[PDB]
Write a protein that binds this ligand. Sequence first.
Ligand SMILES: N[C@@H](CCC(=O)O)C(=O)O
Ligand SMILES: N[C@@H](CCC(=O)O)C(=O)O
Lengths: 307, 307
Amino acid sequence: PDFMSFTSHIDELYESAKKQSGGKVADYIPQLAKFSPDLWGVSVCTVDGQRHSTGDTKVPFCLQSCVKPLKYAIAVNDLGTEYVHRYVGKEPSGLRLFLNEDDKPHNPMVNAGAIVVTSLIKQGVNNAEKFDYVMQFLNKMAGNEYVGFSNATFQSERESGDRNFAIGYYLKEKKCFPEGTDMVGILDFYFQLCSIEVTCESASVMAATLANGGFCPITGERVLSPEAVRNTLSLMHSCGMYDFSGQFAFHVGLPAKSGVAGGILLVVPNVMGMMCWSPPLDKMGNSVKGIHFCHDLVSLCNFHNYD
Amino acid sequence: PDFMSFTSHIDELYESAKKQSGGKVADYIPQLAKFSPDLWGVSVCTVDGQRHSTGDTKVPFCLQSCVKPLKYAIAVNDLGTEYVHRYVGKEPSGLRLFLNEDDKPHNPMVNAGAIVVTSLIKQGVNNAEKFDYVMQFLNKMAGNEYVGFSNATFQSERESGDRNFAIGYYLKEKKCFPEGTDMVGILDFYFQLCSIEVTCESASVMAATLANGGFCPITGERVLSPEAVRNTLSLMHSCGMYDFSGQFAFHVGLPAKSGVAGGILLVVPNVMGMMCWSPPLDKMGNSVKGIHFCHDLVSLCNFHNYD
Ligand SMILES: N[C@@H](CCC(=O)O)C(=O)O
Ligand SMILES: N[C@@H](CCC(=O)O)C(=O)O
């Protein structure tokens, strides 16, 4: 209704979350540990293309696990729900290395499922063409705003990702991949996808595309099928916030996805997309200021699923 | 928009689910095993008070686990979210006897959590007054339509409920109950609540009250607080369908609760309530015809959360 007055409220919510200085910046690679704890930005993009930013909204950071819903959406878009879910389940595990009763990863939002989803995208071409394909897809989702790549993050991520290699070999042993998959090459592609860089501004438009039925709000183009969008939102609602996913569903009731860079990709269906970013993470791996901001936003604006 | 034409579609969906003859009638007590497999009814009550029934909609059956959301709602209504959730968690387990990391039952929809919720209601009075209190509450939810009691079910349920006694003593040992709780008397009250009888017709109005923000649509009275209703819908969405809850959330995306009598209490927020009932259950414990009907209903009418 009144965007300028909604904007004032976002700025007050921003300002209250800012005083919240707890948490620890991820440090398992130097490219994460570098980041200032005081960095804090929130960008909004409505379903009608209205924009508002406050704080550090033009500083690039890596999507990390925030890319998981986006590549899941790409796979469902290209391949359909049924094909994708031959390989990956549709529900939460407890707690956030094992497979479900059908020897599938529990869902696309845990590393095992994201690694499997990565193996399904653009099969038969080399990694450079797979990567370019996804990069172009994210450009459409972002209405051609900032989408980059951190080579330093990619190289450290691959050198230090012992757990992800253990998962890969485990998935190989349980036959979780499509026929003819080079698992080690899939891990590389996965590491690369984690290392894609956005700003709060550009990521908010990606979230707005999900909020707007798969149409990008600042270009008007259909980027994702209705089915892709719907599946992605369902899984972001139940599985997007690591071991906090249940509590977030209860108290906030919006589809969101967090990552270790401190991003929270938030969708308010039929209203807007947002990206909140602040490096310091709580014990569950979620941005301290962004979790605070999300609780406040739903209280103020009555955006809960079952409001 | 056009109720009479919506009604025709419900009848076609009813008719298609009817041909679905799989499943097994529960038989762990004779009061369940008695029931014909061919019994099948669907009742709708809209948020504006419009009614439609098809099939066996006036044959009483026991709420069984369908009562779980209703007593959880009563407790939050009387005591608030914060008090109730000192005792019970807010999220799914995997798979559907243990407690969460805080030694609480995972949520109100598993037996352990429902037993704890039962211990919180109307504390300090005797069981007859507790029971009368809840019966009167269900009368308000149902707009004074059919609410009864099966004494035969209550007596068999208590004689044969070895698992529930094991849970009770386990909860007693982990200190899960409020101070001064008679655990064995709480189990009785729990058995009694399972044995409350409704028809599809009367249960649909209970569901419509949840669909309508806690106001009963055929009387207009406020029965439940906004908070009670919202909490209940969140937990029905994630935890209401036993081990099928994840898949139901994905494919159907509505708050529902199933029970072993073959009932499915379904809420379509801001639109309507329904009760589907058919005794024969699938391997997960859900009504075969009602699961089929629910999938079909969401396909036809676009009622999914993230449609
Ligand atoms: N690259 C990290 C992603 C961590 C995250 O964003 O949670 C991993 O694969 O473990
Ligand atoms: N009285 C049954 C309820 C079963 C159900 O409806 O799932 C029990 O407590 O196990």
